[PDB]
């Protein structure tokens, strides 16, 4: 709290002692002009801050004063679209109907005072007032019942903002205890001009995959989910493509998301997430791209995280950071060959009937596999698996015999499994060792900082701890 009596920079002393984003204040209109004026000098009117005010602050006017930052949240009653005549008509009905209920109930006459009270007030005192009958009024499609203190329980609150033209514009409505808003995510527009760096608030795209990133529906106890988890706006393809299609808030967690949550506590980020639309990772076909790689090349999001594989083609168009987890490709079989040179893989012309491969199409390995020797892949064209879980059960039943995919996830699936019946060939044999990292837009200044910070956590012994929680070993 601040003492206006000391109207000098002593207030700025107490005011300077708070560092945070959202500031809430409760003061009068005249003092509001001065306090916001002082903040603009120090810099709290910056682009990163949010001001929240109650109704009484400048609500009952159409001419805004100066020194108020462009962009303000208030919940008021001003009722932009309502009319006084509408309010008066409701008020008149409250008068007549409530008195009608009391008068007709007991033939009650509302005895009036002979004048304004000099002496003749006393005889009307014993007469019962309308309070027992004025608390409850009906009609007009609204429970206009009052209370002891004289405030309604069914009001008409609205939320309103300061637009660019210094003209108040309605945003959302409050009715039947819900927050209906015309805005899904915050607009984040600037303060009063001549101060607008606006170089922050990165957007991030992510895919739902193996334990790197996991998606879940929002818990219905409080329409949110437990702390230590980040919300993310998943798109949908609507119901039967009839119409609409709702951007549904559903928080998501996992490994890759956790690392940036701790990462952005030392680089001061502000972030939002939305998942993918089409495809799984991406492929450069017909000289065009789609996927997260496609998203970044067209500036959909400055950053891009998740399960992303570093490779020759990918680094040609977009830059990559220093990898933090080692991986590659591997093969998984049930319960009889040495590897990429094994003669069994060379030709299916052996005495035994041919066996099959998993080799999920439209991936990263397939493009790499095409590069060295083709004849295996045209064999793989005949039989292509789908998904991940669908592939493993097919191997378990005996529809396939040699599943090929990246090792960083096969070791997990073999670990958290039943009976340890599935293993990888050899002692964790690996081919074409490769790392996983975070890709950023080309030429961005984020390059040096994001690299240095990511390397620092590796030294502090944090990767081991985070690995253990989401990389468990049951068969180990």
């Amino acid at each position: 709290t601040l003492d206006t009596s000391f109207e000098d920079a002593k207030t700025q002393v107490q005011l300077k002692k708070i560092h945070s984003s959202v500031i809430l204040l409760y003061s009068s209109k005249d003092e509001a002009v001065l306090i916001l004026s002082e903040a603009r000098s120090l810099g709290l009117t910056g682009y990163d801050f949010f001001w929240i005010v109650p109704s009484l602050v400048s609500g009952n006017t159409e001419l805004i004063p100066k020194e108020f930052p462009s962009g303000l949240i208030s919940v008021s009653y001003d009722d932009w679209d309502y009319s006084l005549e509408a309010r008066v008509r409701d008020g008149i009905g409250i008068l007549t109907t409530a008195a009608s209920s009391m008068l007709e109930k007991f033939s009650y006459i509302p005895e009036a005072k002979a004048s304004c009270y000099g002496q003749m007030e006393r005889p009307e005192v014993p007469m019962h007032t309308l309070h027992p009958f004025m608390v409850n009024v009906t009609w007009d499609g609204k429970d206009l019942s009052f209370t002891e203190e004289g405030y309604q329980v069914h009001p008409r609150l609205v939320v309103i903002v300061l637009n660019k033209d210094r003209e108040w514009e309605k945003v959302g409505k409050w009715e039947n205890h819900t927050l209906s808003l015309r805005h899904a995510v915050w607009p984040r527009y600037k303060s009063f001009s001549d101060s607008e760096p606006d170089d922050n608030h990165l957007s991030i795209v992510t895919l739902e995959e193996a334990p790197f990133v996991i998606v879940e529906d929002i818990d219905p106890l409080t329409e949110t989910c437990v702390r230590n988890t980040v919300p993310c706006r998943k798109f949908v393809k609507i119901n039967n493509s009839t119409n609409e299609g709702m951007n549904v808030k559903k928080c998501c967690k996992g490994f890759s998301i956790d690392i940036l949550k701790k990462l952005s506590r030392t680089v001061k980020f502000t972030y939002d997430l939305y998942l993918v639309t089409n495809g799984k990772h991406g492929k450069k076909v017909n000289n065009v791209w789609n996927g997260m790689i496609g998203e970044v090349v067209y500036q959909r999001a400055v950053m891009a995280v998740g399960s992303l594989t570093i490779n020759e083609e990918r680094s040609e168009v977009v830059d990559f950071s220093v990898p933090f987890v080692e991986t590659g490709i591997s093969v998984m079989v049930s319960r009889q060959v040495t590897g990429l040179s094994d003669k069994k893989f060379q030709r299916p012309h052996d005495y035994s009937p041919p066996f099959r491969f998993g080799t999920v199409p439209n991936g990263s390995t397939e493009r790499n596999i095409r590069n060295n020797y083709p004849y295996m892949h045209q064999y793989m064209t005949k039989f292509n698996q789908k998904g991940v879980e669908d592939a493993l059960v097919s191997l378990k039943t005996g529809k396939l015999d040699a599943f090929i995919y990246d090792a960083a996830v096969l070791n997990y699936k073999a670990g958290r499994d039943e009976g340890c019946k599935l293993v990888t060939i050899g002692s964790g044999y690996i081919f074409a060792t490769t790392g996983y990292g975070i890709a950023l837009q080309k030429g961005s200044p984020w390059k040096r900082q994001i690299d240095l910070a990511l390397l620092q956590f590796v030294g502090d012994g944090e990767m081991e701890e985070l690995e253990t929680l989401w990389l468990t070993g049951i068969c180990h």
Partner: nanobody
Amino acid sequence: VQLQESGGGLVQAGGSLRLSCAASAAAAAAAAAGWYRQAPGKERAAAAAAAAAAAAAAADSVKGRFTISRDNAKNTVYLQMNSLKPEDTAVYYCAAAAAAAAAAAYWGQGTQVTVSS
């Protein structure tokens, strides 16, 4: 939201044009604006983009022929195109995405640009 595209016509090869797409909204600071091209027999293709931060990306296919610009004060994005070639004959479209909303792919009626001798 709704947008509106205009600026087309017939111009000889090597000429120039000024296409424009505009929309109404009080938050116009934060929208990706992109240009799409779709010729007969070919899929829709990206041409030029503008980011929220203020970066410009140009497609390598017809790089250098045109240029993009956005006015923060007035809600309109107009595309300045130069050194026209017959390969550019198509109907250009304007679009936006994100900052709220849903069902995110927004397409105008269309403006046809014709380049010929």
